[PDB]
């Protein structure tokens, strides 16, 4: 979330 | 310490790694908390010390209080000044969507970039920074949407 794996 | 957009690098992992991006304005460096977890930063021979941070807003400022106070007008297209790892800074124009929350509505941009792009600035047509890219969600179809995350200028 930060989407790279998230 | 010139104004502008900066990569946030670390040499703790293999080689040199870009963990995020930030904005230098008015003597203050602005990035997202999850990029630095509030650590101090080297800028050449000098050191930047954290000054303000908030995990819930996912923001942090160095050398001074948060300076960026422009806001999306809710109508106009904006530009992500994306600074991807290992790649040149590039502007991407888009019309923001909206995060609807119990505490009001937040602009959001549906642009997907590497993790180390976190902290790249989102700009209005006057070149003012309306927020930082990289705190978001993944939509029912697997696409990424980032809030336009803007701090408060004390």
């Amino acid at each position: 979330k930060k989407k790279g794996x998230x | 310490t010139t104004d502008g957009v900066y990569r946030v690098m670390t040499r703790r992992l293999l080689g040199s790694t870009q963990v995020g991006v930030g904005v230098m304005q008015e003597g203050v460096f602005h990035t997202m908390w999850h990029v630095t977890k509030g650590a101090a930063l080297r800028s050449g021979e000098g050191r930047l010390d954290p000054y303000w941070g908030d995990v819930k807003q996912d923001l942090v400022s160095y050398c001074g209080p948060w300076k960026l106070d422009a806001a999306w007008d809710g109508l106009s297209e904006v530009q992500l000044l994306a600074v991807p790892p290992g790649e040149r800074a590039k502007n991407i124009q888009t019309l923001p969507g909206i995060f609807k929350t119990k505490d009001g509505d937040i602009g959001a941009v549906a642009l997907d970039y590497p993790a180390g792009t976190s902290g790249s600035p989102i700009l209005d047509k006057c070149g003012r920074v309306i927020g930082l890219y990289g705190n978001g969600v993944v939509i029912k179809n697997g696409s990424y949407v980032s809030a336009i995350t803007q701090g408060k200028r004390e």
Binding site: - | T2, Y6, A39, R42, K56, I92, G97, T101, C126
Partner: protein, 38 residues
């Protein structure tokens, strides 16, 4: 130990590529700073 590297001016680019849509999403922000879909 982290360091910064200048990458550019902060400026609007007249000829910029346009892309991405404009989703309207109900979300929640938790105390850890994570957004979630409702």
């Amino acid at each position: 130990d982290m360091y910064i590297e200048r990458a550019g001016d902060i400026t609007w680019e007249k000829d910029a590529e346009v892309t991405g849509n404009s989703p309207r999403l109900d979300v929640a922000l938790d105390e850890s700073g994570d957004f979630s879909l409702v």
